[PDB]
């Protein structure tokens, strides 16, 4: 049985506030500044509201897992990264947040619920068990940090708050980091890729060399993030002349070499094509370049042949680009082989 974080037992505290009547207050993460700011550090006068407070069906997932997300006021963009990515995958998503229709609010019976969540994390070789109670930082009536585009979705929120158990209070995520996320969520190990130190935008071969890798990793069920280093201040959440956000990450959803047909071979002077597709995980997608669906390129391509290839998305979010056109304006990747025993057990 998976190993409780802290002597907590999720479905006995659960089952004794049912018996009760009564919502779950944790006793090692209260509702206090000391869960969100480091000792003696002042931060903003928050309110905590638990998810009927802040608006009415609350529900962790609205439809399903991958809704926009936003990090908030004084959330951190690399937490919405890495729960992007999580999201791709159900078996991984499913792997950190456990049972999840038996903690899903249900408007019928609604005396299951009790204010109490809990969740897997990867630390020190074993699944560990993080129980919360769902109060969350409160300022205008609205979450200040991680949360969805739907104002009655927690998902988000309350992986962010079990998060931040683990790392002492919400400050500390500032520390944080899309890779490490991603290990304490899947179990496997992460390896990041600097674009700009490797100068893969200037090799070919090595470029082709590392695009071997990332079929690898993605097509053995790996997670693969790219980002775009913000390194000034001045630099975060700047929008980049093609589209793409400094600061931010996109998650890869598919990576995969296309073949074109007879005939484009015209237009493309190609056959084969490294191709990458991400997910925006802030909402509609933004890339201009080559192979956004409003490029020359998407346009020369009819819709059966794009079938036909592979190169589909399932909503807006996602987007195609070359993995030359990856290198050129990416920085860095984050590549989270999983590991298949850490699951299993």
Same mark, same amino acid.
């Given at each position: 049985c998976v190993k409780p974080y802290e002597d907590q037992n999720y479905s006995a505290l659960r089952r004794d506030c049912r018996r009760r009547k009564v919502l779950f207050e944790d006793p090692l993460f209260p509702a206090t500044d000391d869960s969100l700011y480091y000792k003696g550090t002042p931060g903003p006068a928050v309110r905590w509201k638990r998810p009927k407070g802040i608006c009415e069906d609350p529900r962790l997932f609205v439809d399903g897992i991958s809704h926009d997300l936003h990090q908030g006021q004084v959330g951190?963009?690399?937490?919405?990264?890495?729960?992007?990515?999580? +999201?791709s995958r159900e078996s991984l998503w499913q792997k950190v947040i456990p049972d999840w229709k038996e &903690? !899903? %609010?249900?408007? #019928?019976?609604? *005396?299951?619920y009790a204010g109490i969540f809990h969740f897997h994390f990867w630390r020190f070789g074993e699944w560990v068990d993080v129980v919360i109670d769902d109060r969350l930082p409160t300022v205008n009536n609205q979450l200040i940090?991680?949360?969805? *585009?739907?104002?009655?979705?927690? %998902?988000?929120?309350?992986? !962010?708050?079990?998060? +931040?158990? $683990? +790392?002492?209070?919400? &400050?500390? $995520?500032d520390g944080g980091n899309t890779a490490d996320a991603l290990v304490d969520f899947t179990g496997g190990v992460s390896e990041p890729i600097d674009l700009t130190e490797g100068d893969? +935008? *200037?090799? #070919?071969?090595?470029? *082709? &060399?590392?695009?071997?890798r990332m079929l690898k990793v993605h097509s053995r069920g790996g997670?693969?993030?790219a980002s775009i280093k913000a390194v000034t201040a001045a630099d975060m959440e700047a929008r980049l002349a093609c589209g793409l956000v400094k600061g931010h990450a996109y998650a890869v959803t598919d990576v995969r070499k296309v073949r074109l047909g007879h005939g484009l071979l015209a237009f493309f002077k190609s056959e084969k094509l490294d191709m990458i597709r991400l997910?925006?995980?802030?909402?509609e997608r933004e890339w201009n370049g080559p192979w956004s669906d409003t490029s020359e390129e998407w346009q020369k391509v009819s819709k059966s042949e794009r079938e036909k290839m592979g190169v589909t998305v399932q909503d807006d979010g996602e987007f195609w680009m070359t993995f030359e056109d990856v290198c050129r304006y990416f920085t860095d990747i984050i590549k989270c082989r999983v590991i298949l025993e850490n699951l299993y057990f």
């Open positions: 951190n963009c690399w937490f919405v990264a890495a729960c992007s990515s999580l +999201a &903690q !899903e %609010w249900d408007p #019928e019976k609604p *005396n299951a940090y991680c949360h969805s *585009n739907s104002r009655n979705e927690f %998902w988000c929120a309350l992986v !962010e708050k079990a998060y +931040a158990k $683990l +790392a002492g209070c919400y &400050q500390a $995520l893969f +935008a *200037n090799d #070919e071969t090595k470029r *082709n &060399q590392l695009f071997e997670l693969i993030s997910r925006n995980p802030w909402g």
